[PDB]
Design a protein that fits this description.
The complex is a heterodimer of chains A (467) and B (10). Chain A is mainly alpha-helical and 467 residues long. Chain A folds into 2 domains: 4-236, no CATH class; 297-458. In chain A, 53% of the residues lie in helices and 4% in strands. Chain A has 20 helices and 6 strands. In chain A, strands 3-2-1-4 form a 4-stranded antiparallel sheet, covered by helices on one side. In chain A, strands 5-6 form a two-stranded parallel sheet. In chain A, a hairpin with a 4-residue loop joins strand 1 (153-156) and strand 2 (161-165). Chain A is globular and about 75 Å long. The N and C termini of chain A lie far apart (78 Å). Chain B is largely without helices or strands and 10 residues long. Chain B is flat, with a radius of gyration of 6 Å. The chains are: A mainly alpha (467), B little secondary structure (10). The interface between A and B is medium-sized, with 26 and 8 residues. Chain B: It comes from Homo sapiens. Chain B: It is found in: Nucleus. Chain B: This is MLL cleavage product N320.
Amino acid sequence: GLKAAQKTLFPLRSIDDVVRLFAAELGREEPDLVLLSLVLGFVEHFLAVNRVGLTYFPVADLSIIAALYARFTAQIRGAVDLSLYPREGGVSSRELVKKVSDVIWNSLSRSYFKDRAHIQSLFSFITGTKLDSSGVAFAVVGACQALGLRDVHLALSEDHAWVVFGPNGEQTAEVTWHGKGNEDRRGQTVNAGVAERSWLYLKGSYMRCDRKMEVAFMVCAINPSIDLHTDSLELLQLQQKLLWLLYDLGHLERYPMALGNLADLEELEPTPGRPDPLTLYHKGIASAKTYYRDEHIYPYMYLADYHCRNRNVREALQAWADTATVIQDYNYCREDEEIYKEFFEVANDVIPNLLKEAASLLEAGSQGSALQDPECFAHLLRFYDGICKWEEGSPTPVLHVGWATFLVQSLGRFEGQVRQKVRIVSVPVLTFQSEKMKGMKELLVATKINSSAIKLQLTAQSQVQMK
Amino acid sequence: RWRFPARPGT
């Protein structure tokens, strides 16, 4: 497998030597996913998992990396006989992709915690026989590249990974598990999930990677965590530098989440002469609008979290409103629980905490407060409108009474005189999409909000207590 | 623990 030109940079003695390797591979016809994932996993093992003995950087010797490479390629070539699966015309078959998926799956440790850190790379697969969910999909794509199957590529939503292949790259196959206690669907298409308009499959507006984007995925998959309180500065630096390399070559253009990740790293440690974090967050949103029909949630969540961290209440509320405007056109389905948890935490923890602090600061005489800005009240209302509209037509409900007390409290953080300025109109001015918010319009301007009436309108509950 | 690569937040 390893060609002479792939070996000339070893040993890798620094962050910068690893970046040089990535640069060299990204300059080749096709970057070697197996080589690159092994190198990252090796470096991550000795910078985050076991730093005993570390003095600067874990030197990656060719003999060591080549031996791991050979273990991988021997395992895949011996287990997958290509003669059994004839390939017409640069196109792999569903049976072949399933075989490769089975070889990876069947190699894993019988029992292990699937939620651990540092089990994403081919280094983990070879040395520990352990992979996380998305790691299995990446490993299938790396195995397929090692086999010469140029048409097999990684597909990514915001919470899941699978593969595309076949004539025109138009076929889809599940190759790993999703979540905890869901039933395998390995071998099947993603068409039911697309048709049901779940967030998990993005209404079909998911990422179809080329090889360079598969390199970007492995970079985003670097985990600098040493423990709950400490990150590896070395791995943060490596991730940041590799992301800029990919950015400069054009390979983040269609990868919103990578752009957000890069923006986050720039906020932590700015690189002189590069774009500000805000510019990068906006670029991520633009990517989602340009390539994915503005059907992604996380570009707006990335932006909102940045404003939240910086206590920009107005801009945080606007970005969460924008978040909800995306989700409103989805149906909440069985395996979408991660995005429900995110909306729940924003509505019922994050926004309440932000508004509580804003209330204290207003008491102390703050000027230009979000709490005195009717446009901010309108953003709060748009946030809840999008969540209510999301619920419409969904097979599983979203709202319940455990949301209602937080809604009443948040509404109440704006005085009646501020709330009155927003004009709610039918199809500061706001239009509601959801039937639940339309029915609540009446209640939104009283000096003291009617808590019980709000609760009734937000929830399926239609009666009050009997006695 | 484990988070999906490049998901926002902590």
